[PDB]
């Protein structure tokens, strides 16, 4: 209950018996952090049957949004003020029988920037510790050609032409 | 069978062929050539004559910067995958990050202080 | 008691044969502590036959040896590591069995 | 309307991320290719400029009358274990063949 | 020519005795190896009673039967249950 974005809930039995019809039931297994007893799909299950009752009622109705037959099954949480009035609250996506909460485009980016820059700052502090300075010496860490080489290069090319490389 | 008597039976290890590498979609690989006559020269290759390039100093700094770069790259990849509708979405579920505390002020203060 | 110690140690060693649990422990930082390497060194008593007689899942022992190389624990923090090791394990297992079976059957059918 | 503006802000953010990534890459590559001769003034000259400019720019962009980012949500559509040569090109080599592991991981 | 032939013979001898030494190494492992057969049968039945020693007849890429104690067996497993 600390952070709903950072929780994942699963169950093996329901995994092989999973189909477009049963996705809501899997979310409904109860003891699932994402879903709640307060939702009306749960009130309906207490009563008999389920049909256009989510439109007659207008409240918390978890409904499947998009579905790929094998694994992908996205669920959306809506709050209805009246029939033909829908307000989207959140989205919980199920990949490989593993339920996650869809991250906000911005909470994800905030955490991401924080981790990267924290790493950069640790690296910077460590680098600053080692650098040592003196005005005479300059900087240090805490851890040419005699120009007679043109004739040597001429001799090198001469022996190249004389003794060819046979790689 | 009515009271089997176990005797000292010695068995030799069944190491006739080893599967050094196992590929996907079948395709077994028997890399082990079971040789020694050439293994002496193979070990002579290891012998000297005179973990990345050097990598004894600044290893921590190098790894830290690499990790920061990797996180940056992952975020960029996700942003480029949102840049289009290819295997992705962007539906704005009218929500509201409600913080039930005075977290902001305290956090700001402590952060600035440290 | 010593019985509970034996049972918990057996369960832990049999659980170590899981790459997911190994990646769990590596990410959570349990391997970096110098106490866990000594615990692993103590856990080597399972190599004896009298102790190996009670091991239901034998795939752990070999894995345990790798954990002593001190380079296996520095790596494996990645999830791709667990991916690859479980891939190779299940591949060896299933391919060995079913490939022996299929090779025998196919050769017997083709030679006829 | 706001969707057009939202997309514009998203593209600006993409640009910023790309620039920062490039900078970091060049920096570490240069460290590995220089090793010696590198001195504290130059190392400080590079770390500070890259990080400060890119980070300040990103925060500035995030807080200039841009769409509310907590509103929108990202939920995967299709996953196919098929080889893809276009996502490998588009993400510059990482994250190929959108499999099942990649959506919980990213 | 004699020297060359001698060197070839030496190489042959080397490979042969190296293989003989490998056989000797097997024999040294084998000597300590001798044990009760019934015990071998019981251990084989133990490791083979489940899906560990042999892949199951119908085991495709997608099975709860894993080479490790899954996660539900771990959840009831003494290990963390008693550590809690």
């Amino acid at each position: 209950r600390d952070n709903l974005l950072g929780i994942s809930w699963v169950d093996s039995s329901w995994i092989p018996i999973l189909n477009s019809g049963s996705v809501l039931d899997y979310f409904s297994e109860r003891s699932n952090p994402f879903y709640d007893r307060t939702c009306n799909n749960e009130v309906v299950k207490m009563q008999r049957l389920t049909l256009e009752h989510l439109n007659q009622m207008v409240g918390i109705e978890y409904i499947l949004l998009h579905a790929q037959e094998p694994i992908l099954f996205i669920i959306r949480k809506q709050q209805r003020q009246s029939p033909a009035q829908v307000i989207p609250l959140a989205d919980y996506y199920i990949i490989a029988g593993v339920i996650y909460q869809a991250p906000d485009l911005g909470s994800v980016i905030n955490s991401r920037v924080l981790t990267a820059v924290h790493g950069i700052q640790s690296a910077f502090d460590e680098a600053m510790s080692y650098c040592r300075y003196h005005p005479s010496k300059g900087y240090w860490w805490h851890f040419s050609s005699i120009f007679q080489r043109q004739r040597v290069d001429a001799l090198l090319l001469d022996l190249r032409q004389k003794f060819p490389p046979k790689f | 069978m009515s009271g089997v008597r176990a005797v000292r039976i010695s068995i030799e290890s069944a190491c006739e062929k080893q599967v050094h590498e196992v590929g996907l979609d079948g395709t077994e690989t028997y890399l082990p050539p079971l040789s020694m006559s050439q293994n002496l020269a193979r070990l002579a290759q290891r012998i000297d004559f005179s973990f990345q390039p050097s990598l004894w100093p600044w290893d921590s700094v190098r790894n830290n910067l690499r990790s920061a770069l990797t996180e940056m790259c992952v975020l960029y990849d996700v942003l480029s995958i949102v840049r289009d509708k290819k295997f992705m979405t962007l539906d704005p579920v009218s929500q509201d990050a409600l913080p039930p505390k005075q977290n902001p002020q305290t956090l700001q203060l402590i952060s600035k202080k440290k | 008691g010593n019985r509970l110690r034996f049972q918990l140690e057996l369960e832990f060693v049999q659980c170590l044969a899981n790459p997911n649990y190994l990646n769990f422990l590596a990410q959570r930082g349990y391997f970096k502590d110098k106490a866990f390497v000594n615990y692993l060194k103590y856990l080597l008593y399972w190599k004896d036959p009298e102790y190996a007689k009670y091991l239901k899942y034998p795939q752990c022992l070999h894995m345990l040896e790798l954990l002593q190389y001190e380079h296996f624990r520095k790596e494996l923090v990645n999830a791709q590591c667990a991916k690859f090791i479980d891939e190779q394990q299940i591949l060896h297992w299933q391919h060995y069995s079913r490939k022996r079976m299929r090779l025998q059957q196919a050769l017997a059918e083709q030679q006829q | 309307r706001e969707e057009k503006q939202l997309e514009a802000s998203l593209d600006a953010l993409l640009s910023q991320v790309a620039d920062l990534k490039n900078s970091l890459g060049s920096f570490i590559c240069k460290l590995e290719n220089e090793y010696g001769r590198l001195t504290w003034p130059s190392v400080l000259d590079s770390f500070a400029l890259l990080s400060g400019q890119l980070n300040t720019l990103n925060k500035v962009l995030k807080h200039e009358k841009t769409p509310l980012f907590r509103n929108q949500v990202i939920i995967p559509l299709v996953l196919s274990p098929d080889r893809d040569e276009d996502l490998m090109r588009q993400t510059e080599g990482r994250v190929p063949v959108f499999s099942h592991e990649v959506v919980p991981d990213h | 020519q004699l020297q060359k032939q001698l060197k070839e013979a030496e190489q042959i001898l080397a490979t042969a005795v190296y293989q003989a030494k490998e056989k000797l190494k097997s024999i040294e492992k084998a000597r300590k190896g001798a044990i009760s057969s019934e015990e071998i049968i019981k251990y084989a039945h133990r490791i083979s009673a489940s899906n560990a020693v042999c892949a199951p007849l119908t085991w495709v890429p997608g099975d709860p039967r894993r080479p490790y104690p899954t996660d539900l067996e771990m959840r009831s497993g003494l290990l963390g249950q008693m550590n809690n």
Partner: peptide, 10 residues
Amino acid sequence: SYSPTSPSYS
């Protein structure tokens, strides 16, 4: 189609 792949998809 695409069941989670313990061995890689063929």
